[PDB]
Amino acid sequence: KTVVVTTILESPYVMMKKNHEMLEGNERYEGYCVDLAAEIAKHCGFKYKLTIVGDGKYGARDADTKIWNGMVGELVYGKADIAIAPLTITYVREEVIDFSKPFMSLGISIMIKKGTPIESAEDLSKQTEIAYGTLDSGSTKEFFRRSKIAVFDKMWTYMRSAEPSVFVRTTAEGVARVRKSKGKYAYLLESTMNEYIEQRKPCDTMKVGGNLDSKGYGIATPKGSSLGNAVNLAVLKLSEQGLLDKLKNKWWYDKGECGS
Amino acid sequence: GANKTVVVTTILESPYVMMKKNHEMLEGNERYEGYCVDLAAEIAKHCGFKYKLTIVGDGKYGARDADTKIWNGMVGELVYGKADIAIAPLTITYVREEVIDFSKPFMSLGISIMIKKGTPIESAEDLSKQTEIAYGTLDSGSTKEFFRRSKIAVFDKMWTYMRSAEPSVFVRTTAEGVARVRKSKGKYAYLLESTMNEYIEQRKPCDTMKVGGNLDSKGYGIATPKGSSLGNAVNLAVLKLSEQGLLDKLKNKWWYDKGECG
Ligand SMILES: NS(=O)(=O)c1cc2c(cc1Cl)N[C@H]([C@H]1C[C@H]3C=C[C@@H]1C3)NS2(=O)=O
Ligand SMILES: NS(=O)(=O)c1cc2c(cc1Cl)N[C@H]([C@H]1C[C@H]3C=C[C@@H]1C3)NS2(=O)=O
Ligand SMILES: N[C@@H](CCC(=O)O)C(=O)O
Ligand SMILES: N[C@@H](CCC(=O)O)C(=O)O
């Protein structure tokens, strides 16, 4: 009767606690999605086990093999019962798994090292001194691959062939590359993650320009799962009680690392 | 059996659905224009159905009578089988999700405050702590329900005031709330969704303003009767339109490209 929850190590959604090496089970983890999982499970009346996605990916389909990886794959192949993570609701994913109504909003955004002479996606597209890229196997990369918008398509044509690769395996790696590249790398990532990082030491990154799109994260289940309806009602209840706002404010709490 | 014209319930709410110039000699869907008229056409094209737009009889979004338990508005038209789909600025809410289905959201919004320019109010907390400036909400919608149900002290305080205020602070249509702000010399502020607030802020005579942050975060969805076979296709259409940038293009068309305040 224990529900297997797939999730991903992505700050501040799920993180290893201090001294996690002597902790066990769900108690190893903390973050927005850890708290959200506990609330959803309490409303729906299930016990659950948090498991970190084996390949560390969000989820994409191989164009050749047509196999899904990441958390999406874990749902598709029956390795998990639900995904509670910053997993973007997208058309291609909705074809193969189910999603609750969104629990958090986001859009694609630009992270620069402070002082970089870039204010917009158009700015990035019109120059070549500053490299830029995205996370592999997620919705941001797919956004650029599929876009017919001139600026974004121009960006895709550059990124897909850039050498060395501009794509990164994890968000943390993209952020580190921004920080270490003396302004010669900018990173395309979701506004949620960008805003979290902007408020943390060493306070050397910034979000610039407006978001490139508008969407949300949802709780995902395998297609047709019996859990979907109750999970969706739980998201709506927690939204209306103000609990999703409370969790956002807790995990994006500003302690004054950067200025004050 | 054979394909049948889909009955779309919607609501006369600018800029979502508006009477076209020359509507008096036009018929059918041609009578109307706006964001939801354009959206209905896109959804119908993707889903492969023909449709008839029909303005909700009672002019309401939809609420359940606590005594009779009967649903009114667009929600009621779906619940009682009078319409096949609602394409409107209909907020996705818990109590509605219990009785009808919703697509993923096609537009985001939150509850917000509209003031007459110069009114000395910056926030809901400001409103809650004074009595000179009256304030209220639309009837039979999700904003009123938000206040009625809130356990948050500031919003509970606001509800306690609004529910007993005399004369009534509630309005039957958004237009009536706008008029009350505009005519009340700063002595009425209106609680309404950020989408509608931002639209009115760009309409003549450019005398209103949104103040403060939004009080919540939610969205509008396309609604169908519970279990309707149309829901899956409509949902995928919303996602496709979102990802193609078409929803953003439509919002800019109806809010900003046509703005009258500069
Ligand atoms: N401010 S936020 O992104 O934490 C945030 C974002 C969102 C919230 C709640 C919060 Cl707190 N709830 C809404 C939900 C309420 C109902 C209407 C839309 C979904 C279903 N989703 S959202 O609009 O994606
Ligand atoms: N900027 S906006 O409100 O017009 C707006 C708002 C939204 C859009 C698209 C636009 Cl253009 N799409 C998203 C949709 C994309 C997928 C993720 C959440 C739903 C399904 N809904 S939203 O986040 O409510
Ligand atoms: N939230 C994204 C991952 C991050 C990104 O692609 O920027 C997804 O669900 O794929
Ligand atoms: N969108 C709201 C109506 C507007 C409001 O309540 O402010 C609803 O679906 O009830």
Swiss-Prot record, chain B:
UniProt modified residues of type Phosphoserine: S150, S184
Annotated site (Interaction with the cone snail toxin Con-ikot-ikot): R64, R148, K240
Positions marked as site (Crucial to convey clamshell closure to channel opening): I121
Binding-site residues, L-glutamate: P89, T91, R96, S142, T143, E193
Glycosylation sites: N3
Tissue-by-tissue expression: Detected in forebrain. Detected in dendrites of neuronal cells. Expressed in the pyramidal cell layers of CA1 and CA3 and in the granule cell layer of the dentate gyrus.
Disulphide linkage map: C206-C261
Topological domains annotated Extracellular: 120-262
Modification after translation: Palmitoylated. Depalmitoylated upon L-glutamate stimulation. Ubiquitinated by RNF167, leading to its degradation.
Subunit structure: Homotetramer or heterotetramer of pore-forming glutamate receptor subunits. Tetramers may be formed by the dimerization of dimers. May interact with MPP4. Forms a ternary complex with GRIP1 and CSPG4. Interacts with ATAD1 in an ATP-dependent manner. ATAD1-catalyzed ATP hydrolysis disrupts binding to ATAD1 and to GRIP1 and leads to AMPAR complex disassembly. Interacts with GRIP2. Interacts with GRIP1. Interacts with NSF via its C-terminus. Interacts with CACNG2, PICK1 and GRIP2. Interacts with GRIA1 and SYNDIG1. Part of a complex containing GRIA2, NSF and NAPA and/or NAPB.
Domain notes for this protein: The M4 transmembrane segment mediates tetramerization and is required for cell surface expression.
Other comments on record: The postsynaptic actions of L-glutamate are mediated by a variety of receptors that are named according to their selective agonists. This receptor binds AMPA (quisqualate) > L-glutamate > kainate.
Family listed: Belongs to the glutamate-gated ion channel (TC 1.A.10.1) family. GRIA2 subfamily.
Name under which the protein is recorded: Glutamate receptor 2
Shown residues within the full chain: 413 to 795 of 883
